[PDB]
Short mmCIF file of all heavy atoms in Angstrom, two decimals:
data_model
loop_
_atom_site.label_atom_id
_atom_site.label_comp_id
_atom_site.label_asym_id
_atom_site.label_seq_id
_atom_site.Cartn_x
_atom_site.Cartn_y
_atom_site.Cartn_z
N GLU A 48 -5.29 8.45 23.88
CA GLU A 48 -4.73 9.67 23.32
C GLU A 48 -4.33 9.48 21.86
O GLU A 48 -4.61 10.34 21.02
CB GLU A 48 -3.53 10.13 24.15
CG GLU A 48 -3.91 10.58 25.55
CD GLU A 48 -2.70 10.96 26.38
OE1 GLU A 48 -1.57 10.70 25.94
OE2 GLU A 48 -2.89 11.52 27.48
N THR A 49 -3.69 8.36 21.55
CA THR A 49 -3.35 8.02 20.17
C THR A 49 -4.34 7.05 19.55
O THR A 49 -4.26 6.79 18.35
CB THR A 49 -1.94 7.43 20.10
OG1 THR A 49 -1.87 6.26 20.92
CG2 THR A 49 -0.92 8.43 20.60
N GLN A 51 -4.43 3.80 19.99
CA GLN A 51 -3.57 2.74 19.47
C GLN A 51 -3.46 1.62 20.49
O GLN A 51 -3.20 1.87 21.67
CB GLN A 51 -2.17 3.27 19.13
CG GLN A 51 -2.15 4.34 18.07
CD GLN A 51 -0.74 4.80 17.75
OE1 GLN A 51 0.19 4.57 18.52
NE2 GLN A 51 -0.58 5.46 16.60
N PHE A 64 2.60 -0.97 17.43
CA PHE A 64 1.69 0.09 17.03
C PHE A 64 0.53 -0.52 16.26
O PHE A 64 0.74 -1.41 15.43
CB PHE A 64 2.41 1.14 16.17
CG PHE A 64 3.46 1.91 16.91
CD1 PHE A 64 4.71 1.35 17.15
CD2 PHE A 64 3.21 3.19 17.36
CE1 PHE A 64 5.68 2.06 17.84
CE2 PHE A 64 4.18 3.91 18.04
CZ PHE A 64 5.42 3.34 18.28
N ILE A 141 -9.80 13.08 16.04
CA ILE A 141 -8.80 12.25 15.37
C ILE A 141 -7.60 13.09 14.94
O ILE A 141 -6.48 12.58 14.83
CB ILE A 141 -9.43 11.49 14.19
CG1 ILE A 141 -9.79 12.43 13.04
CG2 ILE A 141 -10.67 10.74 14.65
CD1 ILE A 141 -9.48 11.85 11.68
N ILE A 142 -7.80 14.39 14.71
CA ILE A 142 -6.66 15.29 14.48
C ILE A 142 -5.77 15.32 15.71
O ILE A 142 -4.54 15.23 15.62
CB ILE A 142 -7.16 16.70 14.11
CG1 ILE A 142 -7.41 16.81 12.61
CG2 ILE A 142 -6.17 17.75 14.57
CD1 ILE A 142 -7.94 18.16 12.18
N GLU A 143 -6.38 15.45 16.89
CA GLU A 143 -5.62 15.43 18.13
C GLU A 143 -4.93 14.08 18.32
O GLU A 143 -3.78 14.02 18.77
CB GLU A 143 -6.54 15.75 19.31
CG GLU A 143 -6.11 15.13 20.63
CD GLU A 143 -6.87 15.72 21.81
OE1 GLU A 143 -8.02 16.15 21.62
OE2 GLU A 143 -6.30 15.75 22.92
N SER A 144 -5.63 13.00 17.98
CA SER A 144 -5.02 11.67 18.08
C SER A 144 -3.80 11.55 17.18
O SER A 144 -2.78 10.99 17.58
CB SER A 144 -6.05 10.60 17.74
OG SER A 144 -7.10 10.59 18.69
N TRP A 145 -3.88 12.08 15.96
CA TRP A 145 -2.76 12.00 15.03
C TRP A 145 -1.60 12.88 15.49
O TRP A 145 -0.43 12.53 15.31
CB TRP A 145 -3.24 12.40 13.63
CG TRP A 145 -2.16 12.57 12.63
CD1 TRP A 145 -1.59 11.59 11.87
CD2 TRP A 145 -1.53 13.79 12.25
NE1 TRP A 145 -0.64 12.13 11.05
CE2 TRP A 145 -0.58 13.48 11.26
CE3 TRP A 145 -1.68 15.12 12.65
CZ2 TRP A 145 0.22 14.45 10.67
CZ3 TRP A 145 -0.88 16.08 12.06
CH2 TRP A 145 0.06 15.74 11.08
N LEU A 146 -1.91 14.04 16.08
CA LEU A 146 -0.85 14.87 16.66
C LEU A 146 -0.14 14.13 17.78
O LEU A 146 1.09 14.16 17.88
CB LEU A 146 -1.44 16.17 17.18
CG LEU A 146 -1.71 17.27 16.16
CD1 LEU A 146 -2.15 18.52 16.89
CD2 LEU A 146 -0.47 17.55 15.33
N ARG A 147 -0.91 13.46 18.64
CA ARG A 147 -0.29 12.66 19.70
C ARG A 147 0.50 11.50 19.11
O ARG A 147 1.50 11.07 19.68
CB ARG A 147 -1.36 12.16 20.67
CG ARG A 147 -0.79 11.67 21.99
CD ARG A 147 0.16 12.71 22.58
NE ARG A 147 -0.55 13.85 23.13
CZ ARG A 147 -0.75 14.06 24.42
NH1 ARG A 147 -0.29 13.21 25.33
NH2 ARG A 147 -1.42 15.13 24.82
N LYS A 148 0.06 10.98 17.96
CA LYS A 148 0.83 9.97 17.25
C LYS A 148 2.21 10.50 16.87
O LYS A 148 3.23 9.85 17.11
CB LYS A 148 0.09 9.51 16.00
CG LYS A 148 -1.15 8.67 16.23
CD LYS A 148 -1.80 8.36 14.90
CE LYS A 148 -3.16 7.72 15.07
NZ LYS A 148 -3.62 7.09 13.81
N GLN A 149 2.24 11.69 16.28
CA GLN A 149 3.51 12.29 15.90
C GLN A 149 4.40 12.53 17.12
O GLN A 149 5.60 12.24 17.09
CB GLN A 149 3.27 13.60 15.15
CG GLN A 149 2.48 13.44 13.87
CD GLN A 149 2.96 12.28 13.04
OE1 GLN A 149 4.07 12.30 12.50
NE2 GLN A 149 2.14 11.24 12.93
N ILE A 150 3.81 13.05 18.20
CA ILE A 150 4.59 13.32 19.40
C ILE A 150 5.15 12.03 19.98
O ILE A 150 6.33 11.97 20.36
CB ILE A 150 3.73 14.09 20.43
CG1 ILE A 150 3.44 15.50 19.91
CG2 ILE A 150 4.44 14.14 21.77
CD1 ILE A 150 3.14 16.50 21.01
N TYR A 151 4.33 10.98 20.06
CA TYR A 151 4.82 9.69 20.53
C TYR A 151 5.89 9.14 19.61
O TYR A 151 6.76 8.38 20.04
CB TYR A 151 3.66 8.69 20.62
CG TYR A 151 2.91 8.71 21.94
CD1 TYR A 151 2.74 9.88 22.66
CD2 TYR A 151 2.37 7.54 22.46
CE1 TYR A 151 2.06 9.90 23.86
CE2 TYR A 151 1.68 7.54 23.66
CZ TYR A 151 1.52 8.72 24.35
OH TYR A 151 0.84 8.73 25.54
N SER A 152 5.83 9.49 18.32
CA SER A 152 6.84 9.04 17.38
C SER A 152 8.19 9.71 17.64
O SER A 152 9.23 9.05 17.58
CB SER A 152 6.38 9.31 15.95
OG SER A 152 7.44 9.09 15.02
N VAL A 153 8.18 11.02 17.93
CA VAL A 153 9.45 11.73 18.06
C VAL A 153 10.26 11.22 19.25
O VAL A 153 11.49 11.14 19.19
CB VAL A 153 9.21 13.26 18.14
CG1 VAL A 153 8.41 13.64 19.37
CG2 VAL A 153 10.55 13.97 18.15
N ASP A 154 9.58 10.85 20.33
CA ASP A 154 10.25 10.25 21.49
C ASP A 154 9.39 9.12 22.03
O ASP A 154 8.17 9.27 22.18
CB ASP A 154 10.54 11.29 22.58
CG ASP A 154 9.32 12.12 22.96
OD1 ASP A 154 8.27 11.98 22.30
OD2 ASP A 154 9.42 12.92 23.91
N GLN A 155 10.03 8.00 22.34
CA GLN A 155 9.31 6.79 22.73
C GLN A 155 8.86 6.82 24.18
O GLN A 155 8.16 5.89 24.61
CB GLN A 155 10.15 5.54 22.47
CG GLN A 155 11.09 5.53 21.25
CD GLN A 155 10.65 6.43 20.10
OE1 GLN A 155 9.66 6.15 19.43
NE2 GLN A 155 11.40 7.50 19.87
N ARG A 157 6.62 8.57 25.44
CA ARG A 157 5.22 9.01 25.45
C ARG A 157 5.04 10.40 26.07
O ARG A 157 3.94 10.78 26.46
CB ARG A 157 4.32 7.97 26.15
CG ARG A 157 4.20 8.08 27.67
CD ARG A 157 3.68 6.79 28.27
NE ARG A 157 2.52 6.28 27.55
CZ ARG A 157 2.06 5.04 27.65
NH1 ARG A 157 2.64 4.15 28.42
NH2 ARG A 157 0.98 4.69 26.94
N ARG A 158 6.11 11.19 26.10
CA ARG A 158 6.05 12.52 26.70
C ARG A 158 5.09 13.41 25.92
O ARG A 158 4.74 13.15 24.77
CB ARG A 158 7.44 13.16 26.73
CG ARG A 158 8.43 12.45 27.64
CD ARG A 158 9.82 13.05 27.48
NE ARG A 158 10.84 12.26 28.17
CZ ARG A 158 12.14 12.44 28.04
NH1 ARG A 158 12.63 13.38 27.26
NH2 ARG A 158 12.98 11.66 28.72
N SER A 160 5.80 16.68 25.36
CA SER A 160 6.60 17.85 25.00
C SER A 160 7.45 17.51 23.78
O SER A 160 7.94 16.39 23.65
CB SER A 160 7.49 18.29 26.16
OG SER A 160 8.44 17.30 26.49
N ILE A 161 7.63 18.50 22.90
CA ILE A 161 8.44 18.35 21.70
C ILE A 161 9.25 19.63 21.52
O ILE A 161 8.76 20.73 21.79
CB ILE A 161 7.58 18.05 20.46
CG1 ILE A 161 8.47 17.76 19.25
CG2 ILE A 161 6.61 19.18 20.18
CD1 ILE A 161 7.70 17.35 18.01
N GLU A 165 13.28 18.70 17.46
CA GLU A 165 12.39 17.58 17.22
C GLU A 165 11.25 17.98 16.29
O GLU A 165 10.80 17.18 15.46
CB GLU A 165 11.85 17.05 18.55
CG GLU A 165 12.92 16.84 19.61
CD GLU A 165 13.78 15.61 19.37
OE1 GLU A 165 13.55 14.90 18.36
OE2 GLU A 165 14.68 15.35 20.19
N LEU A 166 10.76 19.21 16.42
CA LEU A 166 9.72 19.70 15.52
C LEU A 166 10.23 19.75 14.08
O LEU A 166 9.50 19.41 13.14
CB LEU A 166 9.23 21.08 15.96
CG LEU A 166 8.16 21.71 15.08
CD1 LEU A 166 6.84 20.98 15.23
CD2 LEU A 166 7.99 23.18 15.41
N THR A 168 12.56 17.81 12.89
CA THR A 168 12.63 16.42 12.44
C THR A 168 11.27 15.89 12.02
O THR A 168 11.15 15.15 11.04
CB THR A 168 13.23 15.52 13.53
OG1 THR A 168 12.32 15.45 14.64
CG2 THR A 168 14.58 16.05 13.99
N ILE A 169 10.22 16.25 12.76
CA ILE A 169 8.88 15.74 12.47
C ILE A 169 8.23 16.42 11.27
O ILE A 169 7.47 15.77 10.54
CB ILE A 169 7.98 15.87 13.71
CG1 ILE A 169 8.51 14.98 14.83
CG2 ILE A 169 6.54 15.49 13.39
CD1 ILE A 169 8.45 13.50 14.51
N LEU A 170 8.52 17.70 11.03
CA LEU A 170 7.82 18.44 9.98
C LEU A 170 7.88 17.79 8.60
O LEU A 170 6.85 17.79 7.91
CB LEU A 170 8.34 19.88 9.93
CG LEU A 170 7.30 20.88 9.43
CD1 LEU A 170 6.06 20.83 10.31
CD2 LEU A 170 7.86 22.28 9.39
N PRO A 171 9.01 17.25 8.13
CA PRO A 171 8.97 16.55 6.84
C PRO A 171 8.38 15.15 6.94
O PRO A 171 7.98 14.59 5.91
CB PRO A 171 10.43 16.53 6.39
CG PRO A 171 11.23 17.17 7.50
CD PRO A 171 10.36 17.16 8.71
N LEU A 172 8.31 14.57 8.14
CA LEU A 172 7.61 13.30 8.29
C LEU A 172 6.13 13.46 8.01
O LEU A 172 5.49 12.56 7.44
CB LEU A 172 7.84 12.74 9.70
CG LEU A 172 9.00 11.76 9.90
CD1 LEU A 172 8.61 10.38 9.40
CD2 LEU A 172 10.27 12.24 9.21
N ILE A 173 5.55 14.60 8.39
CA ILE A 173 4.16 14.89 8.06
C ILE A 173 4.06 15.52 6.68
O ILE A 173 3.02 16.09 6.34
CB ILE A 173 3.51 15.76 9.15
CG1 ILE A 173 4.23 17.11 9.27
CG2 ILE A 173 3.56 15.05 10.49
CD1 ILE A 173 3.73 17.96 10.42
N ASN A 174 5.14 15.47 5.90
CA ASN A 174 5.14 15.74 4.46
C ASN A 174 5.02 17.24 4.20
O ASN A 174 4.48 17.66 3.17
CB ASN A 174 4.02 14.94 3.78
CG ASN A 174 4.19 14.83 2.27
OD1 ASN A 174 3.97 15.79 1.53
ND2 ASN A 174 4.56 13.65 1.80
N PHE A 199 1.49 19.92 24.49
CA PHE A 199 0.65 19.37 23.42
C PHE A 199 -0.34 20.40 22.91
O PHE A 199 -0.62 20.45 21.70
CB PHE A 199 -0.07 18.12 23.92
CG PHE A 199 -1.06 17.57 22.94
CD1 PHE A 199 -0.64 16.89 21.82
CD2 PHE A 199 -2.42 17.74 23.14
CE1 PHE A 199 -1.54 16.39 20.91
CE2 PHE A 199 -3.33 17.23 22.24
CZ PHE A 199 -2.89 16.56 21.12
N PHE A 202 1.47 22.73 20.62
CA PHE A 202 1.68 22.07 19.33
C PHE A 202 0.41 22.06 18.50
O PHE A 202 0.45 22.31 17.29
CB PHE A 202 2.18 20.64 19.56
CG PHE A 202 2.64 19.95 18.31
CD1 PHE A 202 3.09 20.67 17.22
CD2 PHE A 202 2.62 18.57 18.23
CE1 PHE A 202 3.51 20.02 16.08
CE2 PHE A 202 3.05 17.92 17.09
CZ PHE A 202 3.49 18.65 16.01
N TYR A 206 -0.10 23.91 14.95
CA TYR A 206 -0.51 23.12 13.79
C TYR A 206 -1.69 23.78 13.08
O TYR A 206 -1.69 23.95 11.84
CB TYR A 206 -0.85 21.72 14.29
CG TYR A 206 -1.65 20.83 13.38
CD1 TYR A 206 -1.42 20.79 12.02
CD2 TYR A 206 -2.66 20.03 13.90
CE1 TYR A 206 -2.15 19.98 11.21
CE2 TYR A 206 -3.40 19.22 13.09
CZ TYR A 206 -3.15 19.20 11.74
OH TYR A 206 -3.89 18.38 10.93
N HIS A 1072 -2.85 16.26 4.40
CA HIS A 1072 -2.28 15.01 4.88
C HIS A 1072 -2.03 14.02 3.75
O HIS A 1072 -2.22 12.81 3.90
CB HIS A 1072 -3.16 14.38 5.96
CG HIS A 1072 -2.94 14.95 7.32
ND1 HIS A 1072 -3.17 16.28 7.62
CD2 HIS A 1072 -2.52 14.37 8.47
CE1 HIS A 1072 -2.89 16.49 8.89
NE2 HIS A 1072 -2.51 15.35 9.43
N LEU A 1109 1.30 18.38 3.11
CA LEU A 1109 0.36 18.44 4.22
C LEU A 1109 -0.69 19.52 4.00
O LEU A 1109 -1.88 19.29 4.25
CB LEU A 1109 1.12 18.68 5.53
CG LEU A 1109 0.36 18.99 6.82
CD1 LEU A 1109 1.17 18.53 8.00
CD2 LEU A 1109 0.11 20.48 6.95
N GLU A 1176 -5.88 8.24 6.95
CA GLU A 1176 -6.26 9.17 8.00
C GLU A 1176 -5.97 10.61 7.59
O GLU A 1176 -4.87 10.92 7.13
CB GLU A 1176 -5.52 8.82 9.29
CG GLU A 1176 -4.19 8.11 9.06
CD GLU A 1176 -3.38 7.95 10.33
OE1 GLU A 1176 -3.98 7.98 11.43
OE2 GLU A 1176 -2.15 7.78 10.24
N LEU A 1177 -6.97 11.47 7.75
CA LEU A 1177 -6.89 12.91 7.50
C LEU A 1177 -6.62 13.26 6.04
O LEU A 1177 -6.52 14.44 5.71
CB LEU A 1177 -5.84 13.60 8.38
CG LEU A 1177 -5.96 13.57 9.91
CD1 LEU A 1177 -7.28 14.20 10.29
CD2 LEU A 1177 -5.79 12.20 10.55
#
Side-chain angles (χ1 to χ4, degrees):
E48 293 177 350
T49 59
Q51 299 181 342
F64 294 79
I141 71 139
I142 273 178
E143 152 167 29
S144 295
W145 171 86
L146 280 185
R147 197 50 74 103
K148 289 177 189 195
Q149 299 315 292
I150 292 205
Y151 272 34
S152 170
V153 63
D154 51 354
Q155 325 333 290
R157 86 198 313 163
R158 295 173 189 170
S160 64
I161 186 175
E165 313 285 0
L166 179 70
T168 67
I169 295 295
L170 209 57
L172 267 282
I173 62 186
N174 197 286
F199 174 74
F202 189 25
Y206 164 41
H1072 278 61
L1109 171 153
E1176 27 172 22
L1177 299 301

